Ligand binder design. Structure first.
Ligand SMILES: O=C[C@@H](O)[C@@H](O)[C@@H](O)CO
Ligand SMILES: [Ca+2]
Ligand SMILES: [Mn+2]
Length: 237
């Protein structure tokens, strides 16, 4: 299967597959069953901001999610990503709905990776930033129901013209260029990702969430990965 590392913004508690009994943030290493979670006080209809950081020295993947005027939620997990991921990856956003639903709207997305070697003055680096998505976004790969360009946003999951989210939807967006997270002469490797998002539901119980992920470069939406599997995983193992 694909190899997946993800930070999940999980809006629906599937306690049968180990979710806590509340909306939560989590760190997913090759399984939808988060290695670590923290409670997340999601705010229906408000614009949130997620931040993800990691470096190869501390080997700690951390995330922070916040809304204006509110405390933030944070979660961290010790993992060496060079032991999980291949040396070339793609980075992306994914989201899903099931029998419960929500908008999975991305308003902005930025990423920076750096490989610093022991050569004097020798950094390799990639940075992108989207504050405005367009209809024909050639530096993104859209998969499943993902679309760009309406209100300059990336709608990861399906929404009607009148703007109501649809259930049983799944969509991802990957940056077009492969990213290099390891090289043999690297003395420090780091990445960071930020995204702003607007999850809205007509319903008291929204589902299913949004994830930032890192994958093998050929990664595709697994079969049956609507709902609780967040467009990331083929099953709940
Ligand atoms: O070797 C590293 C460089 O290619 C970097 O720019 C990549 O991580 C980004 O495409
Ligand atoms: Ca869930
Ligand atoms: Mn979860």
């Amino acid at each position: 299967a694909d190899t997946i590392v993800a930070v999940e913004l999980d809006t629906y508690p599937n306690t049968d597959i180990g979710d806590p009994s509340y909306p939560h943030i989590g760190i997913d290493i090759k399984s939808v069953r988060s290695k670590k979670t923290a409670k997340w006080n999601m705010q229906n209809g408000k614009v949130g901001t997620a931040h993800i950081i990691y470096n190869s020295v501390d080997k700690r993947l951390s995330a922070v999610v916040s809304y204006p005027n509110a405390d933030s939620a944070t979660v961290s997990y010790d993992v060496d990503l060079d032991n999980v991921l291949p040396e070339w990856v793609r980075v992306g956003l994914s989201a899903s709905t099931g029998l419960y639903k929500e908008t999975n709207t991305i308003l902005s997305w930025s990423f920076t990776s750096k490989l610093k070697s022991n050569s004097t003055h020798e950094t390799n680096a990639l940075h992108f930033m989207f504050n405005q998505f367009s209809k024909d976004q050639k530096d993104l790969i859209l998969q499943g129901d993902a679309t760009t360009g309406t209100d300059g946003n990336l709608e990861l999951t399906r929404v009607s013209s009148n703007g109501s989210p649809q259930g049983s939807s799944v969509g991802r967006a990957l940056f077009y260029a492969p990213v290099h997270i390891w090289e043999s002469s690297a003395v420090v490797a780091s990445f960071e990702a930020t995204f702003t998002f607007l999850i809205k539901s007509p319903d008291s119980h929204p589902a299913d969430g949004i994830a930032f992920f890192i994958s093998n470069i050929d990664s595709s939406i697994p079969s049956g990965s609507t709902g609780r599997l967040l467009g990331l995983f083929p099953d709940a193992n």
